[PDB]
Amino acid sequence: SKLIHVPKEDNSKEVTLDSLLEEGVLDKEIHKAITRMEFPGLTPVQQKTIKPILSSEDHDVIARAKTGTGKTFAFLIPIFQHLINTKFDSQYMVKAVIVAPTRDLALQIEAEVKKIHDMNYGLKKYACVSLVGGTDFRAAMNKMNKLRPNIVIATPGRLIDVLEKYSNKFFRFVDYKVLDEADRLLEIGFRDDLETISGILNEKNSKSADNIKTLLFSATLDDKVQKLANNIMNKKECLFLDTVDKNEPEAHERIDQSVVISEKFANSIFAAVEHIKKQIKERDSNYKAIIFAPTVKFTSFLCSILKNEFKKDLPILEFHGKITQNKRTSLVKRFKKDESGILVCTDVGARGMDFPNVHEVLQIGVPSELANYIHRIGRTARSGKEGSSVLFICKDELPFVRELEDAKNIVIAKQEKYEPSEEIKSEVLEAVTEEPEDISDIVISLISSYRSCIKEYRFSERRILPEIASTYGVLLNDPQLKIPVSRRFLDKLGLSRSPIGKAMFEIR
RNA sequence: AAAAAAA
Ligand SMILES: Nc1ncnc2c1ncn2[C@@H]1O[C@H](COP(=O)(O)OP(=O)(O)O)[C@@H](O)[C@H]1O
Ligand code: BEF
Ligand SMILES: [Mg+2]
Ligand SMILES: [Mg+2]
């Protein structure tokens, strides 16, 4: 398909809700909804995205815009507009399907649709239903039958379940499908699912197999995604709406980035505790921050430490895929409202999630993928607000930082070293309740995690893996100790032959 | 054992 580029214009023409109203692009009902939100004016992506989406319905849309710049409304406003000027057709059928890589992001997008509804009750006739895992399947279908939504927000897994069973009933008249965080949804582990989704929607469409128009949105994507999505893009042409220069870094420039480099991985923990401590003092507990960790078990562990240290000063929230979905939703809306607190989470919260006025984004270790560094720090400095970010890593993780410059052109100017005092180590380690068996599982989970991204971040396996494993000895206050495992376990890991295995483990 | 995703 023909991929048409539309680079970031220098000055360009101003676009406004009023202008789109007078121009005939937008109806008064949707115009009334967004105006009441009292935004200063449409964001760059929104100005560059709305009219093209409503344009000649023989083209697809790819849109790149930095984090926190209102990409959600950039495709929700047009969708609503499409629904208005087709209100006398199909009516009780899904006309827009929005897909997100995490449940909480899908539920967030739903909430944003509900905000549009609350600003104009006239738009409530265009109902919306979310379809995500961890929710009652029957209840969602009853909601489907009752509301007969024109908009569906979903995660790939639950959506396929519904489509396999009810495609004929609701999805024979889809006109739009949206891939939010598109690049992620087009990666291995999601790509096959979205191809399954796209195929079913096309096969079931009443007009034609190429009727559906596809919208791709993310803060991180290139031309590679257009190739990765070639099977889900129906139209013959495709617009690339980019509000970012080719050479410009995808990371938000307003974020004050820094990296704290330590000798070991374990004392990135100590550095972060000292940083948070310093931050709570200076800000007088007026501190809202998100700290990312590489692993669920380590996240839960890091959470346990931060409670013992800072629960007296701030709420500490634990957020990952092993948290029950009810609790995930509960803490997400709390941290959205709260003025302060520390959200401790995995990369489940790396993309899309919009928490107003986060002061800082902290990172212990590396993200699950290179791009997610951009999305991680993107949780702060949103909607014009300021923000800072700190990356806590060890010496053996520097290749990730270098790769960050080589690939994404992200240069972290502020760099500093760190060595923990004996007092801090005693303070933190004295406040661990975990048995040696628990510490083992935690470090093992980190070994598995770091082993899987050796190639991505150009890590030296002979160096990084022993360092991660050595965390076990540090936490038990005995650097000489190795992780106790069985011969079968060491074999299951496949390092029975590798010298690195012996350096990490002790066969008991 | 390892981040998401019908779990
Ligand atoms: N036109 C606008 N002007 C000011 N703020 C906006 C505008 N559009 C959206 N926002 C704000 O941006 C926040 C998050 O936007 P979001 O859709 O998450 O952007 P992205 O998806 O690109 O990260 C929302 O809380 C919203 O209040
Ligand atoms: F890119 Be945004 F944060 F969804
Ligand atoms: Mg978004
Ligand atoms: Mg924020």
Report the CATH number at residue A362.
3.40.50.300
Instruction: Specify whether A341 is located in the same domain as A223.
Output: no
Tell which residue, A209, A228, A239, has the closest CA to residue A50: A239
Looking from the CA of A458 toward its CB, the CA atoms found within 13 Å total 10
Which amino acid residue lies closest to nucleotide B5, measuring CA to C1'? A157
Nucleotide nearest to A156 (CA to C1'): B5
Q: Give the whole-angstrom CA distance, residue A432 versus residue A302.
A: 10
Residue ending a domain, among A248, A283, A305, is A248
For A243, residues 6+ apart whose C-beta sits below 8 A from its C-beta are A8, A44, A45, A48, A64, A65, A66, A69
Annotated binding-site residue? A95: no
Ligand approaching nearest to the C-alpha of A358: 4
- Token readout for A418 is 């760190």
Place of tokens 């997610």: A372
Strand partners, A98: A153, A178
Range of the domain at A149: 2-248
Number of domains in chain A: 2
Annotated binding-site residue? A72: yes
Structural contact between residues A418 and A261, judged by C-beta atoms closer than 8 angstroms = yes
- Token readout for A154 is 């979903």
Cα(A467) to ligand 3 centroid in Å equals 36
Q: Is the dihedral of CA A428, A429, A433, A439 positive or negative?
A: positive
How far is the CA of A370 from the CAs of A128, A222, A395, A471, in angstroms?
34, 14, 18, 23
Burial of A388 per CB tally in 10 Å (0-12, 13-18, 19+): buried
Q: Give the whole-angstrom CA distance, residue A45 versus residue A278.
A: 37
- Token readout for A402 is 């270098």
SS3 assignment, position A487 = helix
Q: Give the whole-angstrom CA distance, residue A77 versus residue A55.
A: 14
Q: Give the whole-angstrom CA distance, residue A402 versus residue A408.
A: 10
Nucleotide nearest to A189 (CA to C1'): B5
Tell which residue, A410, A403, A406, has the closest CA to residue A378: A410
User: Would you say the CB of residue A352 lies under 6 angstroms from ligand 2?
Assistant: yes
Instruction: Specify whether A219 is located in the same domain as A315.
Output: no
Q: Which of A43, A45, A64, A67 has most ligand 2 atoms within 8 Å of CB, for mutation?
A: A67
Q: Give the whole-angstrom CA distance, residue A219 versus residue A74.
A: 13
Q: Give the whole-angstrom CA distance, residue A310 versus residue A464.
A: 30
- H or E element at residue A301: helix A296-310
User: Would you say the CB of residue A383 lies under 6 angstroms from ligand 1?
Assistant: yes
Instruction: Specify whether A219 is located in the same domain as A93.
Output: yes
Cα angle value A119/A349/A219 (rounded, 5°): 75
- Token readout for A238 is 């495709």
> In sequence order, what E strands does A113-212 have?
128-131, 151-154, 176-180
- Token readout for A34 is 């967004």
Place of tokens 């997100």: A100
Q: Give the whole-angstrom CA distance, residue A194 versus residue A3.
A: 21
- Token readout for A437 is 């068996």
Sheet with A237-242, strands from edge to edge, namely A2-6, A237-242, A59-64, A213-218, A176-180, A96-99, A151-154, A128-131
Count the neighbouring beta carbons within 10 Å of the beta carbon of residue A210: 13
Q: Give the whole-angstrom CA distance, residue A431 versus residue A312.
A: 14
Q: Give the whole-angstrom CA distance, residue A118 versus residue A326.
A: 24
Q: Give the whole-angstrom CA distance, residue A173 versus residue A193.
A: 20
Annotated binding-site residue? A69: yes
- Structure-derived torsion over alpha carbons of residues A31, A32, A37, A42, reported in degrees to the nearest 10: 10
How far is the CA of A187 from the CAs of A201, A228, A240, A351, in angstroms?
20, 8, 19, 14
Q: Which atom of ligand 2 is nearest to the CA of A105?
A: 4
Residue closest via CA to ligand 2's atom 1 equals A67
Instruction: Specify whether A262 is located in the same domain as A362.
Output: yes
- H or E element at residue A436: helix A436-451
Place of tokens 């307003």: A254
Tell which residue, A197, A156, A185, has the closest CA to residue A352: A185
Give the CA-to-C1' distance from A483 to B1 in angstroms. 13
Q: Which atom of ligand 2 is nearest to the CA of A354?
A: 3
Instruction: Specify whether A224 is located in the same domain as A201.
Output: yes
- Token readout for A310 is 């800072």
Q: Which residues are found with C-beta within 5 Å of the ion, ligand 3? A: A 71, 352
Instruction: Specify whether A400 is located in the same domain as A502.
Output: yes
User: Would you say the CB of residue A44 lies under 6 angstroms from ligand 1?
Assistant: no
Annotated binding-site residue? A65: yes
Resolution in A: 2.2
Cα radius of gyration rounded to whole Å, chain A: 24
User: Would you say the CB of residue A267 lies under 6 angstroms from ligand 1?
Assistant: no
Q: Give the whole-angstrom CA distance, residue A144 versus residue A504.
A: 53
Q: Which residues touch strand B (CB under 7 A)?
A: A 101-104, 132-135, 137, 154-161, 189-190, 193, 294-297, 320-322, 346-348, 368, 441, 444-445, 447-449, 451-452
Q: Is the dihedral of CA A389, A394, A398, A404 positive or negative?
A: negative
Q: Give the whole-angstrom CA distance, residue A41 versus residue A69.
A: 12
Instruction: Specify whether A152 is located in the same domain as A15.
Output: yes
Place of tokens 């899908």: A106
Residue ending a domain, among A215, A233, A248, is A248
Instruction: Specify whether A134 is located in the same domain as A254.
Output: no
Residue ending a domain, among A248, A277, A302, is A248
Instruction: Specify whether A254 is located in the same domain as A226.
Output: no
Instruction: Specify whether A363 is located in the same domain as A455.
Output: yes
For A76, residues 6+ apart whose C-beta sits below 8 A from its C-beta are A109, A112, A113, A116
Instruction: Specify whether A377 is located in the same domain as A475.
Output: yes
Instruction: Specify whether A343 is located in the same domain as A210.
Output: no
Cα(A354) to ligand 4 centroid in Å equals 6
How far is the CA of A9 from the CAs of A47, A241, A242, A488, in angstroms?
12, 10, 9, 60
Looking from the CA of A413 toward its CB, the CA atoms found within 13 Å total 5
